[PDB]
């Protein structure tokens, strides 16, 4: 069923999990995760954004999340990751997205609190949440206070450690941030990027009040091996192997961060 | 934009060229193959059957299939192929597949006939044309019992067994053109020559159902992409439909067709 | 369910009956119709057009109209009535209206056929039947004029613009067997508001398989506004659907299109 | 556009303006509402009901109700109003209304919050605002009912069904709930009352039967003109009655 990310986060934050999101582009990816969000019992995040949009329709694609987000018997987020600009989000929702994620994080922080405003004044009229961005420099547990209460953000992709996308040696994550972070802060609190990270240490993470993880690259990455193994097979053989991967993986994840069984 | 395949087939028939038949299935092969059928400015028709449901959730993709026909600016034919029960049919129809395929050919002429009218006398009076099919792709199609058939059933188009198979005998078509009126449907078109694909255009044939050759057209660039990111495999596919759909639109004649 | 006007037009002509054509333009003419139908076994068709959109949302009122011919358990034709041009047919397809009536009958001869043929070629290919019209173009001298469609000139003219049925400008039984005689296609009368019943019938014996009908709810609502005007509105308007209902059951009885549904 | 009624009844309540919902339940009702609201560059509710299912078909028109709202160029919330059951509000959800008011106010203190927190507990995850009502009302049964059911906002007694308000009993539940205040049964009410009564928080007031009072009105001055006048006249005199509503409670020009 099409899921409200502000409930889930929070019931996320005062249970101690976090909430998968996932990057899924085309029918096996999406399939993937639904069929593990079902197995394990658990709310999810099906996300697409302007990096895939060279490989797929958005426009029609999304009618298949749509779809399965309401046909599915667990709760389905459909998000829109990295927003770049208000026609792109808009142009997400109208396409039924109903979470939308504004990513104003490179410009300077009067600029990013704007443009966070201006996404957060138009779509919380029409009851759409906005997850927000505020960036080894970590997030300022004041600066994080004030960008949330200036913007109405619903929620706030943090720098605590962890490193967006790649990176050289294992990522550190400061838990003395995620706390005074938490502490500072109304809504909850997002990782984009956690690749690196020790289960113990995303765990701690967790615990400490991250509520929703971004799964960036791993999905790919555990189709590529299905793809690798099934070269020499059926296309269809390939494609149904192909679905198999990305509900393994998506399933580890869920179970790792925890939201296994918190469906129901 | 959503396409009469009857218009179309009627079109291919006086026009001496066949409307290309592709069973799609997942994102990238229905992007490959609108992105050809756009280029080429030729009507295409895009299909799926039970064949797939254990790949893809045909009752969330229909809804891409529907949305890319809509938008399209060439004519697309949603098709439920091989339909081997009112229900399933009459899924398709819901899930808003506008041309239908009961393939009741399995039984003998009799039971072929009855199932096949029953699904005719369900589908005509919603708009709803009815691809049926006598011989089974191994039994040859008889062209007397083609007139019979036809005439009985009511069917809209007839998927002929010529040697064609999921050898090659042109006499058969040849003798079923001058037995029945209605559009002629090839099934199993994948590896015929390309020579031998214009000589079956020539004696009537008027759709040409491709499956194989998209999977293969993808395998190829899968076994070219195994060791890249899945984003730029994915990619490729897409590519690969599309440029194996375009020859395939392009040999069949229905290129500009559209126009 | 959504139905196809080609199919039940040569039913109706096969069977010697004739569909009724209703033009509906707010919920509770919508309803009564769809409730006569249901009520009859009878296939119908729901119309609306140019005339309507000063008082109704066409855009919005077509997914009410939709919605219900589809959940119909009875054939629901849904058509766009005396279209006017390329853009207003345009519309009523892209808002579900499955059968479409271009009129471009006010024209000349050869220029009725451009029109007509124009919206045959765009709409066929998209499966969408087109209704045309052809009147009186007369050969007579102006004096016999003052002392009504020609059956040569209506197989011209469905020959040369493939449209899917006729509206015939006919009571003069003879033209209406002539024009049958003549053209390949069902026949379609507009303006029938007071023929007789029986010459209703005998119109439909010899060839009209679809009848258009023109204030009949209109008039039939305004008995029950009249008979409920110190009522609460709920119950007034209950009373509208009931009155619709009961005018559009007699039309269909009248066309002999109870049953045929079935 | 289809709107968050939390949004728009949290504004009512920080600028003292109440949002007018309507009861429609048919094309004219529909048109003359949006009408009014598009001319005021005002908030709406417009609202289904079971009273109304035997009249029209729910399931059909909500499609009317849902393109008009959708298309507006002014913020339209679809709400199913005094929802008996959990089946009938999940199939107003199911149809695109947006809010659900759940009344299990005919029931005992303690059932009404069981009630109301299993539409509340099924609907939030869901993204679907709840609206209950409670009764005169007592501001600590009210604290105590909104913080125990998680409802989203309060539909209030405080003399309404000449009608006398009790306007203390509009401040002191305004005073110990988080949510905003709902009026049903407002007919009979004084202008003078009414801006009182939004003063002081009430934040949504429910037309009753005042558009069926108009269009029946429209219906007696048209009774021998033919079908298609009366009901444009039907339309009109409910765009007339329903900016009479929105600019009495102050929404106009709020949309903007
Ligand atoms: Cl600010
Ligand atoms: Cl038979
Ligand atoms: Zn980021
Ligand atoms: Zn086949
Ligand atoms: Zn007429
Ligand atoms: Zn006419
Ligand atoms: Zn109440």
Redesign the interface.
Known sequence: ????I???ENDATNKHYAIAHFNV????ML?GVIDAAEEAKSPVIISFGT??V????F???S??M???AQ?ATV?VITHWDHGRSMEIIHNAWTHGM?SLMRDASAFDFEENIRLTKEAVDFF????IPVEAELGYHYTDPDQAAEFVERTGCDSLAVAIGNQHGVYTSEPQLNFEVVKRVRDAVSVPLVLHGASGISDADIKTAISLGIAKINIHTE???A??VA??EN??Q???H???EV?KAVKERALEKIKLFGSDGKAE
Not at 1 to 4: F, T, V
Not at 25 to 28: F, I, K, P, Q, S
Not at 54 to 57: A, R
Not at 124 to 127: C, E, Q, S, V
């Open positions: 069923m099409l899921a409200d502000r409930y889930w582009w085309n029918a096996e399939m990096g895939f060279g490989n797929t329709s426009e029609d694609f009618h298949m749509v779809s399965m046909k709760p109903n919380h009229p029409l009851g999905l790919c990455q189709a590529m793809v690798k070269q020499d059926p296309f269809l390939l494609e149904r679905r």
